[PDB]
Design a protein around this ligand. Structure first.
Ligand SMILES: N=C(N)SCc1cc(Br)cc(CSC(=N)N)c1
Length: 494
């Protein structure tokens, strides 16, 4: 009847005032969430923003990282304090019908992340092992056995394995930046929160600063990682009777998550400065993973003689495919964990890790294999671009499910009926939290129509444009209705 009954309150080792050694024990939950923020679903958008506004959007990365840290800290606090995950809190403060709606929505969000992971991983297979595109997908489907072997390891090592993957994809891109020898003075200048980023004056590659900046901002949090954090934060036993120990545990999880998400922000910055320093101005014409592979494998695309020699030696691209693999391994873990969390919390369905990963991977690869079928039937022509378009269209479910995950979390963490007058949110975070929640919900409701219209490709059918407008208005109004319903229920609780 409690979240993650298998590893809930497993190891609690806070000894005296030796926080650091204690810090070393529970450092796992942060990495599991951070690694999700390093998925290839936005690798191109970082390199693209870099080429279009070199070292300019680096401050937006920092701000988005700060906001994600804020919301993930709120989720970890809810988990730590109430000894229950966000799904459970929401399902208990709301009817089964809304619980089921949220369940399906977050299933679709984790499935979109899984589609991105499978596409990136199958393409990484294609590139590294030259496995046929269609076989790389059916090979990635074999991650259920990797999950079986992963089940017997334990979180002291599983979370360390996630840290291993994190540093893998981090050093892969830091090595190529070390060889680039970029102008770190312009990097520090970009990291400042300048107003050039919010302006609309430059229009490089049909992308203005305000557009790329707002996209980074709206793309701040991942709804499934909220639930993941509120569930994994309970893996450390807490007495829930000593305010000093619970406030200490809050500091623990905060420092952990902030380290890990800082690692993630550093990875995003590395992607941006990768697009700026490594690649030549506008060299990247194909955002696809294959596009970036050949661009890193073509010496005329780099901006340094050393990088030219290395790219001709065919290393930069291989390290990129490796990072693709390291990033696609994330879903197998976190998607399963978070999906189990959301099932067992929203619909009270106890399923094993066997049939979970199976159904998720199948539903994810269905569209992938359909896309591959259609493109290879047109002759593997634009097959990688079509895969990237699928990857990017999948990301609409995240916009669909984000409010129904952030508004409830903020409400339940601010209410004393859930946290008490001692551990509720400060007046400081009350303002920042609500501001960020409003901003993101607005941006995502906006992006709903953009994505729905992008479903019809870059060919604007006049009759299909009005249909897209109708569908988008309907979806945004339905989300508005669901949001006000959830607000009413939660405020009735509080
Ligand atoms: N890195 C990832 N796996 S998701 C980044 C992200 C998160 C949300 Br939430 C919404 C969007 C789409 S924002 C748009 N419609 N332009 C993107």
């Amino acid at each position: 009847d409690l979240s993650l009954s298998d590893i809930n309150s497993t190891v609690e080792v806070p000894e005296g005032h030796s926080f650091w050694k204690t810090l070393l024990a529970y450092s796992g939950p942060g990495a599991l969430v951070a690694v999700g923020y390093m998925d290839p679903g936005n690798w191109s958008t970082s390199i693209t923003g870099g080429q279009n506004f070199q070292y300019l959007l680096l401050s937006i990365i920092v701000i988005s990282s700060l906001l994600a840290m804020l919301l993930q800290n709120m989720a970890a606090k809810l988990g730590i304090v109430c000894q229950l995950d966000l799904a459970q809190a929401i399902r208990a403060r709301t009817s089964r019908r809304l619980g089921f709606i949220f369940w399906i929505l977050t299933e679709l969000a984790i499935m979109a992340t899984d589609i991105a992971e499978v596409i990136g991983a199958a393409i990484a297979l294609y590139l590294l092992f030259k496995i046929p595109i269609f076989l790389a997908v059916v090979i990635t489907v074999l991650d259920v056995f990797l999950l079986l072997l992963l089940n017997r390891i334990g979180f002291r090592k599983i979370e360390a394995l996630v840290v291993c993957l994190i540093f893998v994809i981090l050093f892969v891109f830091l090595y190529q930046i070390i060889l680039s020898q970029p102008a770190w003075h312009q990097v520090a200048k970009g990291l400042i929160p300048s107003w050039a980023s919010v302006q609309t004056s430059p229009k490089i590659g049909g992308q203005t600063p305000l557009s790329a900046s707002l996209g980074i901002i709206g793309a701040t949090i991942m709804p499934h990682n909220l639930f993941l954090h509120s569930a994994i934060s309970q893996s450390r036993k807490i007495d829930r009777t000593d305010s000093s120990k619970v406030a200490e545990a809050v500091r623990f999880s905060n420092w952990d998550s902030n380290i890990q998400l800082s690692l993630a922000m550093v990875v995003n910055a590395l992607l941006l400065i990768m697009g700026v320093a490594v690649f030549k101005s506008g060299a990247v014409q194909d955002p696809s993973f294959f596009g970036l592979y050949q661009a890193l494998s073509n010496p005329d695309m780099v901006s340094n003689p050393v990088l030219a020699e290395a790219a001709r030696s065919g290393v930069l691209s291989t390290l990129f495919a490796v990072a693709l693999l390291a990033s696609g391994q994330n879903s197998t873990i976190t998607g399963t964990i978070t999906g189990q969390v959301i099932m067992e919390g929203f619909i009270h369905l106890r399923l094993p890790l066997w049939l979970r990963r199976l159904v998720t991977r199948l539903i994810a690869i269905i569209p992938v294999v359909v896309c591959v079928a259609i493109t290879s039937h047109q002759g593997s022509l634009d097959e990688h671009q079509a895969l990237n378009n699928l990857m990017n269209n999948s990301q609409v479910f995240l916009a669909l499910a984000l409010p129904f995950s952030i508004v409830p979390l903020l409400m339940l963490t601010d209410s004393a009926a859930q946290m008490g007058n001692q551990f509720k949110n400060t007046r400081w975070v009350k303002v920042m939290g609500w501001l960020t929640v409003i901003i993101l919900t607005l941006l995502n409701l906006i992006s709903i129509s953009s994505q729905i219209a992008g479903f019809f490709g870059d060919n604007p059918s006049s009759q299909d444009l009005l249909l897209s407008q109708v569908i988008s208005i309907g979806i945004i109004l339905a989300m508005i209705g669901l949001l006000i319903w959830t607000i009413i229920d939660i405020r009735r609780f509080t």
